[PDB]
């Protein structure tokens, strides 16, 4: 298990444009295209991302390509965010993956808003942090996923992803 397998499990793989949990056009492995309600706009963002006129369909390789770029960007975003970096640097590898997972799903801003939970992680109060993370819209709207990520922060193991 690693960040890519982890996020591949949580985001799936779809080769045609689809709407994510929030109703937003996305494709591949959770690659958000736009928050616009316009499919055409999404198609535009897609072609731009791929570098060709796709007609809302991409190949597996292309999806993996955006996914790799997306994971990298997420980590890189973590490293440039003063709110996230210290916490990230304080964590072990497994837990770091959990934080990358959240940032990929909701943006570094979204993540930086978990100030208090983040502080608990830095203090290494695992149980406490986990309780706190659950008090969020994130957990209420995507509870299974959230539970997995929270389990990962609580234990520092991949138990929630093993056998999935």
Looking only at residues 32 through 71 of this chain, which bind Cl ion when binding is defined by CB under 5 A? 49
Dihedral, CA atoms, 75, 76, 78, 80, nearest 10 degrees? 170
List the beta bridge partners of residue 26.
18, 32
Q: How many angstroms from the chain centroid is the CA of residue 54?
A: 25
- Residue 83, number of CB atoms within 10 A of its CB: 16
Query: In the bound complex, what is the minimum distance in angstroms from residue 23's beta carbon to K ion?
Result: 12
What is the Cα–Cα distance from 96 to 99, expressed in whole angstroms? Answer: 5
- Would you count residue 142 as binding Cl ion (CB under 5 A)? yes
The closest alpha carbon to 6, from 136, 145, 154, belongs to: 145
Which CB, 30 or 77, lies closer to K ion?
30
Among 140, 144, 157, 164, indicate the residue that binds Cl ion (CB under 5 A). 144
Encoding tokens for residue 66? 């955006």
Indicate the DSSP class of residue 13: -
Given Cl ion, K ion, none, residue 144, with its beta carbon under 5 to 8 Å by kind, binds Cl ion
Check binding of 141 to Cl ion (CB under 5 A): no
Among 17, 28, 30, 32, binds K ion (CB under 5 A): 30
Contact of 59 with 15, CB cutoff 8 Å: yes
Number of residues that bind Cl ion (CB under 5 A): 4
Q: Which stretch binds Cl ion (CB under 5 A): 1-9, 22-30, 33-41, 143-151?
A: 143-151
Q: Is 109 exposed, middle or buried (0-12, 13-18, 19+ CB in 10 A)?
A: exposed
For Cl ion, give the closer residue by CB, 31 or 154: 31
* Residue 145 interacting with Cl ion (CB under 5 A): yes
Residue ranges for the known binding site are: 32, 104, 117, 132
Binding site for K ion (CB under 5 A): 11, 30
Query: Which residues of the shown chain bind Cl ion in the complex (CB under 5 A)?
Result: 49, 142, 144-145
Residues flagged as binding site for substrate: 32, 104, 117, 132
């Amino acid at each position: 298990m690693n960040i890519f397998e982890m996020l591949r499990i949580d985001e799936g793989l779809r080769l045609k444009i689809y709407k994510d949990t929030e109703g937003y056009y996305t494709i591949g492995i959770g690659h958000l295209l736009t928050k616009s309600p316009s499919l055409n706009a999404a198609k535009s963002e897609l072609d731009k991302a791929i570098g060709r006129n796709t007609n809302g369909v991409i190949t597996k390789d292309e999806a993996e390509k955006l996914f790799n770029q997306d994971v990298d960007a997420a980590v890189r975003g973590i490293l440039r965010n003063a709110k996230l970096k210290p916490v990230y640097d304080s964590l072990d590898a497994v837990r770091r993956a959990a934080l990358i997972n959240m940032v990929f799903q909701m943006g570094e801003t979204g993540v930086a808003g978990f100030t208090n939970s983040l502080r608990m992680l830095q203090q290494k109060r695992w149980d406490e942090a986990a309780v706190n993370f659950a008090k969020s819209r994130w957990y209420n709207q995507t509870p299974n996923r959230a539970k997995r990520v929270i389990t990962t922060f609580r234990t520092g193991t991949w138990d929630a992803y093993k056998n999935l």
